[PDB]
Structure formats: structure tokens, C-alpha cells
Amino acid sequence: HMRDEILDPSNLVKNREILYRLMISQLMYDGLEKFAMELSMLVKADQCAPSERLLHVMIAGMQTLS
């Protein structure tokens, strides 16, 4: 489950896989199904559920980096 995912900041390959799943989940949540499915097929992503987790992660991340 995406909710239980614990990051290793040094595994850039795994982190890019996680980012694309978060992007597919965000697109699904916002109703852009065809776009989300086309992206999933191109990057061979694992199954994603609709979620706006990426929006909340972005808000926390930008604050931490500022």
C-alpha cells in the first residue's frame, strides 16, 4: 500500500518508480483516467489507486525545502 511506503533517499531508481505511481494516482483522483492509464503503460507502473497523496506530499516537501 502507498500509505505504508517508507523512503530510502539514496535509492533514486525506486524513488522515481514511487513518484510515477503517485503521479498516476493523482491523475486518477482528478478524473484524468485515459491520461493516467497511458502513463502507466509507458512506465510499466504497479497498480495505483486514486489518491491526492502527491498534492499533500508536495505541500510538505516544498515547506521543508524552503
Euclidean distance between CA atoms 6 and 11, whole angstroms:
12
Q: Which residues in the 5-44 window bind a copy of itself by CB under 8 A?
A: 5-7, 9, 12, 15-16, 18-19, 22-23, 26, 32, 35, 38-39, 42
Task: Examine residue 56 and tell whether it contacts a copy of itself (CB under 8 A).
Answer: yes
Q: Which of 20, 22, 28, 36 lies at the binding interface for Na ion (CB under 5 A)? A: 22
Total residues found in the chain within this entry: 66
Residue 1 or 62: the one with the smaller Cβ distance to a copy of itself is 62
Cβ-based burial of 66 (10 A; exposed 0-12, middle 13-18, buried ≥19): exposed
